[model samples]
Target: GITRDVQVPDVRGQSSADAIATLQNRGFKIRTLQKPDSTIPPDHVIGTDPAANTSVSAGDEITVNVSTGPEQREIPDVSTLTYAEAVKKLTAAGFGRFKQANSPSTPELVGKVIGTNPPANQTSAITNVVIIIVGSGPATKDIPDVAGQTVDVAQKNLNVYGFTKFSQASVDSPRPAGEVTGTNPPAGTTVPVDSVIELQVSKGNQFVMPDLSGMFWVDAEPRLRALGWTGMLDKGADVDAGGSQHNRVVYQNPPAGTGVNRDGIITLRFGQ
Candidate 1:
């Protein structure tokens, strides 16, 4: 005869086969209920009847609610849809919550529906939440001729249009450091808010000239770093030529006074 005071082991995460095996071995009947848990892993046991510490008799059935995780969800194709429209569609499809983040230029009509968190074609558990990114609007002013504008100015201008995505790269040009050379989408071209804008600035003429002499490194170094310039100082010289006591920026290719692209790299010589 089976003992009457046996305790049933919790079996939430166990596979059905495993649960049955364990229950049979322990002489207890098994009952399973599937419920959604946003935080709990899917198919795992959330809890058990009689609780963890409770003692129970053999032959007693223990009930367990298995985690279904977030409800299975299918994200709708929301590309290009206005944020409002996208929300309506998602809500109609049984999604309860949605979020949007975007740049200011993203259109008022769009609000901000860049993409869905679960994406368009993936399956998610019931308790999972979906996040969406949307567009704010479009550029309101002339591209600001950022081509020659300082990187700070360019970034600020881009921010006005909600072009917050930033990336840096090297190039050659005559524009000053941190100054905008040109934009990938080109000024005047309408783009979604938060879209990445590539910039090209000036690298000064390559030939080393005497004009680079006597430039103050104090005023120049911050200017270069601010513009995102990168590269090495002159090859053999250890002396702080640019007047940078810290040897921070000994020499610049185009010299401090020369104009270079905002996105361009200006070689700096380090002084001891």
Candidate 2:
């Protein structure tokens, strides 16, 4: 049998169904493909194989390339965008469905996407496998009250608890050396882990003189000295060291509730 020759019809500017019917009627086997063509509506033929109207043998295959609209669409430029904004942009670009992955939050990017995998602006369909990284928030802990404690002790405790950021701050107080008077946030306040608070430790101890009138001078003198106080007998009287009143403290200057420095002087009055 002799094969008949037919001229391939102009398929461009025709619907897919129309082109297929026309080519098949001419005895050309029909095949179709899609290509990006922004100017044409979807499913319309962009052009044909062997060019339009070329002569080909009967039953030969002719490919009519159809328009699938513009390109598939890009993944979208979402870097540095907030989570809400990024989702909107991705969905607007036809990636309506997506899943999220978490990233440690930092001051620089607590609500933003640092960037994307495979980079942004890549082309895709449906965003089926996207892993959008989003930021969480800062880690935090309650402020610990370490007042009346040594600064070094507080430092050690916080460091052992994994908090090592801060500097020592001094505060005037009646507490002894190394004692913590207060903190910047005080105590029981909540703050981020990296926030710095003052230790507010006391520089030196100050106190009131306790009553030591009933104690023997021998014992009371040592006790006073130990408490950072110096004592001597009455300046106007010739008092004997072994005398009854001199040996026993009958009275003392700087009565109780009298304010005194860490190193302060005390005067004792003695008789017979």
Candidate 3:
């Protein structure tokens, strides 16, 4: 018996079931394969192995390449591209989902794509969202109201806004000593995160003399020194040693209830 050769029919774009049935009807055995094809619908025929019009003996196998749709796509390199232009490339890559982010950059790179979240050439499903990093000026936040707060507490509040740099200086404020008066970039200021914040702590202009009669000179000196009165201690009228006032603050020039000079002389006399 002579074996009759049959030409494989072109089944491109036909569904897998239809393509297989069409080939089987022509006396060719069907071997269906699932593969990714961007242009062809899933379960549809992409093409054939041994190809269409290739003559083969009856009952010979015809490999049908069925579409499994597009494979995972690679993220486009959008660096050096404008935000608008990067969106175009990303859409063309079958990545429809998008998210935006900003980063500090120079004027030239403003509104341009800094980079992508997964970066370039990384594989991602078309439905997966990619963060498009865009170049922008340093982000700004409102300078918090740190008044009356200690420097330690103020630093923590600023840290919330990504501010790390801080410098403190005492200023004359009616608020009270040791209380924060304000900030250099002041509260409610919308400034960049990189801006250095100068905390203005209160150091009352007029130092009030606290009674030091009962306390020892060691204990009393620190109180005056805290008011910015540095090295101003001097010997007042000398008193005999072994007395009740010995080593104790017996006399003070600027008595209690008087406003003392912070940078002026503060004479204290302890027992000899």
Candidate 4:
């Protein structure tokens, strides 16, 4: 019965055949088990069941774990799978040695797999993952609505996004001068990061401001229109209501000689 007590040798993480030989020579029986582990080589012992260095009866069975090598794997050949699904599939195939990278996504491409880094259809080690190119999940923004704003203002809005380039076209609009009427690609359209943001500004109708230092409202109307001014008559908001006023034009904006666009509003105060 003294032979019944024996110290178990440490056989963890060793070749299964070597572990068996070492145990048998020490007067112990051997039991082998195989499991899939991608990190360890095949036929290698993972650990001992009773554990190494445990006291056991001589001739007792020592269960040893033998690695089955990195569980055989294959890379997925197709793109367009969801991120979650892709991960599951790759891991199941023993191909988790790769990484996922971020990229801009379209409405149709959001959350979808774009492709793999090294492409697909290659035999890889169980320890390797096929590099996955994943969509960025969602679009951050669409093209801005720069139409109907001043060219300068439109430029400001677009430039704030840090586009690769700025392109513009100014055309005569019946609306007003210096005002942007529209854009080329329009608005709310999705485009690349390096895309150009175009602007269409109004040229309007140009005219010279005519002097109205001492003109009557009835007389000044036609003269102002002739100079491309859609003249408007308004009492100054700052003017006192009780103050006596001249019925004729005592003052007109753009003075009498400044060049102006006829499409814009021209304010004329007609009271002394």
In lDDT terms, which candidate is top?
A: 3
Q: Which stretches of candidate 3 lie over 4 Å from their true place?
A: 1-138, 205-230, 233-252, 258-264, 268-272
Q: Each model's TM-score?
A: 0.27, 0.42, 0.37, 0.42
Candidate 2 lDDT at 258 equals 73
- CA deviation > 4 Å runs, candidate 1: 1-144, 205-272
Local accuracy by lDDT, each model: 0.59, 0.66, 0.73, 0.67
Q: Which stretches of candidate 2 lie over 4 Å from their true place?
A: 1-68, 71-131, 134-142, 145-153, 165-167, 174-179, 185-197, 202-204, 207-251, 257-259, 267-272
- C-alpha lDDT of candidate 2 relative to the true structure: 0.66
State the number of backbone clashes in model 2.
0
Task: Give candidate 2's TM-score.
Answer: 0.42
Q: Give per-model CA RMSD.
A: 22.6, 10.8, 12.4, 12.8
Ranking by TM-score: 2, 4, 3, 1
* Model 1 TM-score, 2 decimals: 0.27
Per-residue lDDT of candidate 1, residues 223-257 (tens digit): 54564556543434667444454545445666545
Query: Model 2: per-residue lDDT, tens digit, 75-161?
Result: 766556666777777788776656677788664565677655544677766535566776757565567778778888888766665
Clashing pairs in 2: none
Better of 1 and 3 by TM-score: 3
Candidate 4, residues 187-219: lDDT per residue as tens digits?
787665467767778777766665676666677
